[PDB]
């Protein structure tokens, strides 16, 4: 048989087979139920049936909040997307930093008792990303669609007490971009159009190295102007919006948040760690997740941490090319190692010890 790798995020599900260099299936982690049709839907069909369904996101800020919808998602992942028999494959699942013990236990229980998998495993997302970048020590900046985390890792393991979290990620960036574009007299807030804003964000947005100077530049010339062909026809163009949208990550107050920006939470995370490993961490900032894809993001982080760290500190920001899938790749690698055969948690061990064996020492 061949193990399965499933990375569940606030916005997208990444699933596939261990040994593969990338996820075979990537769909929205959305469940649709009748709000006359009587079926409930998952992912892209759920979105296509917006008008007759009520959509919900099973995962909120990286944490599973609705287990019945989460079950549908996993069911749709096995039988529809991957087309496999769960009972047939050991499955490695991923979990967000600081996931409550109860969630880990309930995930385990459902896999074994509902899907009857022969074996399973639960890994922290940030750790899988660090591994993907060929590193055992560093601080990961993981930013996806629903949450952003700072995770300092040392010799293979996360330091829980130092983890920072920020409820600000892609979806917040899309809403903001959608807001500033609506103000200028447009409208989406629908489906193919809300789809359009996200697409404008992922294709035209970037992070400014120096926000004031970019603003001054955008105000003085059309050099930063960009155009986007709408699916209807008209061509909308944007200038300072391009970098104003992502700037929110560094200045949460742009959308009403009192929290510190990602450069500040990265610094605070490092300052919360043992003085003797901080150099390891400053020299190994690894970016992970779709919201770290913005052009300019790494240079900006490098500059802001530099302004906060000791003048002699070697500061390095690492931005892997496929960091949209780092977490999945890291899991694919892990579940593939010859040494991993004895790391799975088997049905036997479960049926004999209970969901509690999903924790470690």
């Amino acid at each position: 048989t061949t193990a399965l790798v499933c990375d569940n995020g606030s916005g997208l599900v990444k699933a596939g087979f261990a040994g593969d260099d990338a996820p075979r299936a990537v769909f929205p982690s959305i469940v649709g139920r009748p709000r006359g049709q009587k079926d409930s839907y998952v992912g892209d069909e759920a979105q296509s049936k917006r008008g007759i369904l009520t959509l919900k996101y099973p995962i909120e800020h990286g944490i599973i909040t609705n287990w019945d919808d989460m079950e549908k998602i996993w069911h749709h992942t096995f039988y529809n997307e991957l087309r496999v028999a769960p009972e047939e494959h050991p499955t490695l699942l991923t979990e967000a930093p600081l996931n409550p013990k109860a969630n880990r236990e309930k995930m385990t229980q459902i896999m074994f008792e509902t899907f009857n998998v022969p074996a399973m495993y639960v890994a922290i997302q940030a750790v899988l990303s660090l591994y993907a970048s060929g590193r055992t020590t560093g601080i990961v900046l993981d930013s996806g669609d629903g949450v952003t985390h700072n995770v300092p890792i040392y010799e293979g393991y996360a330091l829980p007490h130092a983890i920072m979290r920020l409820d600000l990620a892609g979806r917040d960036l899309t809403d903001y971009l959608m807001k500033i574009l609506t103000e200028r007299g447009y409208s989406f807030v629908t489906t193919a159009e809300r789809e359009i804003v996200r697409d404008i964000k992922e294709k035209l947005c970037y992070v400014a190295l120096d926000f004031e100077n970019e603003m001054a530049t955008a105000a003085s010339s059309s050099s930063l102007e960009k155009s986007y062909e709408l699916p209807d026809g008209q061509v909308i163009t944007i200038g300072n919006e391009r970098f104003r949208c992502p700037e929110t990550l560094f200045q949460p107050s742009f959308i009403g948040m009192e929290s510190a920006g990602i450069h500040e939470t990265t610094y605070n995370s490092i300052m919360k760690c043992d003085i003797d490993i901080r150099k390891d961490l400053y020299a190994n900032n690894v970016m992970s997740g779709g919201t770290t894809m913005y052009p300019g993001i790494a240079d900006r982080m490098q500059k802001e941490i530099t302004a906060l760290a000791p003048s002699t500190m070697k500061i390095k920001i690492i931005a892997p090319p496929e960091r949209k899938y780092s977490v999945w790749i890291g899991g694919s690698i892990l579940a593939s190692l010859s040494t991993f055969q004895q790391m799975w948690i088997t049905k036997q061990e479960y049926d004999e010890a209970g969901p509690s064996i999903v924790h470690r020492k």
Partner: protein, 124 residues
């Protein structure tokens, strides 16, 4: 990860132990070849030192060649952690990059390092 045979014989004596990542597995390098590194591969190096009272200390190095594939650099990093855990976590870990290895690492090889082109195919 106790039951791999490589782990069984790791850190049992003073000296160097060098393994190369090969399709998601750790394969020992022929002792007479300690020092030659394929730039397209990744390796795990365990340095064991014996103190005057007979106790052993460990230093783990994972070397990444500039042309290795992600799966190998990933495995090398995971193997280092596992080997360290097997040694009750007493090993100190070191990431070594081609062309920029640490003085300590370079010090393990009297007649210097030999970076040769090529290596084993990716396990993907």
């Amino acid at each position: 990860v106790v039951e791999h045979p490589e782990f069984l014989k790791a850190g049992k004596e003073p000296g160097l132990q060098i393994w190369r990542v090969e399709k998601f597995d750790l394969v020992p390098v022929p002792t007479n070849l300690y020092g030659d590194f394929f730039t397209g591969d990744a390796y795990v190096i365990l340095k064991t030192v014996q103190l005057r009272n007979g106790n052993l200390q460990y230093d783990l190095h994972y070397w990444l060649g500039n042309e290795c594939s992600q799966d190998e650099s990933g495995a090398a990093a995971i193997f280092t952690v596992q080997l360290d855990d097997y040694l009750n976590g007493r090993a100190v870990q070191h990431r070594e990059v081609q062309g920029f290895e640490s003085a300590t690492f370079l010090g393990y090889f009297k007649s210097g390092l030999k970076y040769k082109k090529g290596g084993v195919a990716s396990g993907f």
